[PDB]
Every structure is written in C-alpha cells, then in structure tokens.
Swiss-Prot record:
One of its GO terms (biological process) is dihydrofolate metabolic process. This is Dihydrofolate reductase. It is an enzyme of class 1 (oxidoreductase). It comes from Staphylococcus aureus. It catalyses: (6S)-5,6,7,8-tetrahydrofolate + NADP(+) = 7,8-dihydrofolate + NADPH + H(+).
Length: 157
C-alpha cells in the first residue's frame, strides 16, 4: 500500500523556514494513529527539519549523500527503492518528494488547514476530478486546537 500523508493550508502551504506554520496537536495524533507500526519515507530536508526519527515505525530517508547515516533511520538513494519497501508505506514529505510521488501513490491522507499562512514549501496542485473522497471529517476546535482543519482520505480514480 503506497500513500501520501500531508497537512497543507488553503493554498497548499506545508512549511515555512524549516517549520510547520501551525501548531495543531490533533493532526499529530492523527499522524501517530495512521503511521505507527508502518513506514514513513521522507526527503533529506524534511528529515533534518524534524531532527530525530519518529518512534514505533520505520523511518526511511531518501538522499544522494552516501555518508548519510542516522541511528534508527534506513537510507535509500533511489525513487525506485521506495517500491521495494514492504507493508503500508507513507510518503511524508517534502515538496520535492510529493512532486515526484503524487502521480504514483494509491491514495492520500490530507489534513486541510482552513487558513492562509506564509510559506516557502508547497504541496503540488491536484484536482478532485482525479480523486474520490473516501471520507471527510472535520477536526474539533478547542483550547489547544485553534484552527479549523479537515481530514481527507482521497483515493485515485
Ligand atoms: N511539511 C513538511 O513536509 C515540511 C518539510 N519541510 C522541508 O521541505 C522544504 C523544501 O525542501 P524539499 O526539497 O521539498 O524537501 P525534501 O524533504 O523533499 O528533501 C529533498 C531531498 O531529498 C532527496 N531526494 C529527493 N528526491 C530524490 C531522488 N530521486 N533520489 C535521491 N535523493 C532524492 C535529496 O536529498 P539530498 O540533497 O541529501 O541528496 C533532496 O535534496 C525544506 O525547507 C524542509 O524544511 C519543511 C517544513 C515542513
Ligand atoms: C504533523 C504534520 C504533518 N501532518 C500530516 N498529516 N502529514 C504530515 N506529513 C505532517 C508533517 C511533517 C513534517 C515532516 C514535520 C516537520 C516538523 O518540523 C519541526 C516537525 C514534525 C513533527 C514533529 C514531531 N512529531 C511528528 C512530526 C513533522
């Protein structure tokens, strides 16, 4: 199973100066629920921005640096190596990798942040003509989750 796992805002911003533009604890738990026990693939810049691999799942980093090695991180150097990964595999970031992968994945788990942030990293444009809406669930606003957001699970037609 090959999926995209992304959060972007109303203009597809997914990042600004190595950071998430928004603090949204509910989306983290959403990420933890979907990806625990499975595989996360990410480009080198996405990984360095987190700074440590995420617990209780396989962390795979794509890079051309043959010296790259991090404890708890499996390295690949080829787009093609992604397809040799066993199990449910999530493309986690960033813009470059999504651009390479958005035409290959079976489905996408998008968190739409109903806001307009300043960004420098973008999720690629996509149209609903090509994706069926398997589910659309609004996140709940509260104390710590203060921006409207929506979980989409889109499947390719
Ligand atoms: N929401 C998110 O996913 C967030 C992501 N980011 C980031 O993404 C931003 C923009 O950078 P972006 O380039 O999209 O990040 P990526 O995570 O996609 O990293 C790109 C890197 O991945 C490696 N790579 C990609 N494709 C291949 C390939 N086909 N073969 C071998 N290696 C490959 C290269 O690593 P190498 O150069 O080592 O060879 C390349 O430089 C960064 O500023 C960073 O902060 C920032 C905040 C949030
Ligand atoms: C959740 C945000 C998020 N949500 C969804 N639904 N998909 C995603 N792919 C990401 C994402 C992301 C990037 C990799 C990111 C950047 C970052 O910059 C500091 C910190 C984290 C992060 C710190 C702590 N735990 C998990 C992830 C993740």
């Amino acid at each position: 199973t090959l999926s995209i796992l992304v959060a972007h805002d109303l203009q597809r911003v997914i990042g600004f100066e190595n950071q998430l533009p928004w603090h949204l604890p509910n989306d983290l738990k959403h990420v933890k629920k979907l990806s625990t026990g499975h595989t996360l693939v990410m480009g080198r810049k996405t990984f360095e921005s987190i700074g440590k691999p995420l617990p209780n799942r396989r962390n795979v980093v794509l890079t051309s640096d043959t010296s790259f090695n991090v404890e708890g991180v499996d390295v690949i150097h080829s787009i093609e190596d992604i397809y040799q990964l066993p199990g449910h595999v999530f493309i986690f970031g960033g813009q470059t990798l999504f651009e390479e992968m958005i035409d290959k994945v079976d489905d996408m788990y998008i968190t739409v942040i109903e806001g307009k942030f300043r960004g420098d990293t973008f999720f690629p444009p996509y149209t609903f003509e090509d994706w069926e809406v398997a589910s659309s669930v609004e996140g709940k606003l509260d104390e710590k989750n203060t921006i409207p957001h929506t979980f989409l699970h889109l499947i390719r037609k």
